Amino acid sequence: VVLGGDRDFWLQVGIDPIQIMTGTATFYTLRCYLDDRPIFLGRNGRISVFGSERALARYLADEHDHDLSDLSTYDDIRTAATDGSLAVAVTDDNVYVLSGLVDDFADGPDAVDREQLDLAVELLRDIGDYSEDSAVDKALETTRPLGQLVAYVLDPHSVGKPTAPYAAAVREWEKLERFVESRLRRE
């Protein structure tokens, strides 16, 4: 019953369009939370990603059985898509950038942008939870080189600065980024 051109459409449907930027691609998808758990536009633990807002809108116009399609407001999205009124819009807090982190970790914590990393870890934890795979939780354990480095960057009151070289953290990040890529299903 929420029309596509309504002022607060995405807020009212309770589902967020998100943007994921990597060094080689920018993707769009949808994500929500149901009883404290992230659910993405996807199926079987893999997130459907789209190269443009138009491609996402085209997909949402079609009948689908995926992890969002039985949510009570999903029909509002599909009807907006078929009405031609769906306006996919990503708010600034739903912009997630993995690009460059692999290079920044190699130069140490001072090369890593804290805000970028904070947002990236938010997405990573959501992907790990949605995929029902422990890869993210394990990699970010603070015993490990990467988890220790991430915790340091995200805490401006920490004096436990990891010391060069950062090769171990880089290797662990590369493995984690491969995991993320394995969970993004190109539609």
DSSP letter for each residue of 57-104: HHHHTS---STTTTSTTHHHHHHHHHHT-------GGGEEE-TTHHHH
List the domain boundaries for the chain: 9-94, 98-186
Q: How far apart are CA 168 and CA 165, in angstroms?
A: 8
Give 60's contacts (C-beta < 8 A, 6+ positions apart): 77, 78, 81, 86
Determine contact, residues 56/28, Cβ cutoff 8 Å. Answer: yes
Q: Tokens 């078929």 appear where?
A: 82
DSSP reduced 3-state for 167: helix
Determine contact, residues 75/140, Cβ cutoff 8 Å. Answer: no
Distances (CA, A) of 7 to 2, 72, 118, 132, 165: 10, 19, 29, 35, 50
Please list the residues that pair with 21 across neighbouring strands. 26, 97
**Phi, psi (degrees; rounded to nearest 5) at 61:** -75, -20
Q: Tokens 């907006």 appear where?
A: 80
Which of 28, 176, 42, 167 lies closest to 106, judged by CA?
Answer: 167
**Phi, psi (degrees; rounded to nearest 5) at 148:** -65, -45
Instruction: Give resolution in angstroms.
Output: 1.4
Pairing mode, strands 95-97 and 184-186 = unpaired
Q: How far apart are CA 106 and CA 125, in angstroms?
A: 22
Instruction: Indicate the helix (H) or strand (E) that contains 54.
Output: helix 53-60
